[PDB]
Structure formats: structure tokens, C-alpha cells
């Protein structure tokens, strides 16, 4: 039913159009830490704990 058919003498019969689509992404930040005291590393039995 929807085939583009052209007459012997044709003008302005079939037109087409186009579109475009956009996509996106984002960024985030993470982190964590830990704490200690000098006495802990100084009096500990195991050297090289850090």
C-alpha cells in the first residue's frame, strides 16, 4: 500500500525526512580513609604493620 510509485510525469509526489537522537553520561566521586596513633605502631609487637 505504501510503495513509492512515480507517474510518467511526476512532481512533488514522495517526500521523506530524518531524525537524530542524543545520549548522555555522568561522573561521580568516591573515597575512604583510616586513622592510627604513634603509640600503636611504636609499641606493637609486629614491625612493618603499616
The residues binding a copy of itself (CB under 8 A) are 3-6, 10, 13-17, 20, 28-35, 46
CB of 18 to a copy of itself, least distance (A): 8
Is residue 5 left, alpha or beta, with left meaning phi > 0 and alpha meaning psi from -120 to 50? Answer: beta
The smaller minimum CB distance to a copy of itself, of residues 38 and 49, is found at 49
The CA distance from 7 to 43, in Å, is 98
6 closest CA partner among 15, 31, 27: 15
Minimum CB separation of residue 13 from a copy of itself in Å reads: 7
Cβ of residue 9: shortest distance to a copy of itself, in angstroms? 12
Amino acid at each position: 500500500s505504501k510503495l513509492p510509485l512515480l507517474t510518467e510525469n511526476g512532481g512533488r509526489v514522495n517526500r521523506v525526512g530524518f531524525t537524530r537522537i542524543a545520549r548522555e553520561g555522568s561522573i561521580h566521586k568516591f573515597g575512604f580513609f583510616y586513622e592510627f596513633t604513634q603509640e600503636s605502631i611504636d609499641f606493637d609487637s609486629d614491625d612493618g604493620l603499616m
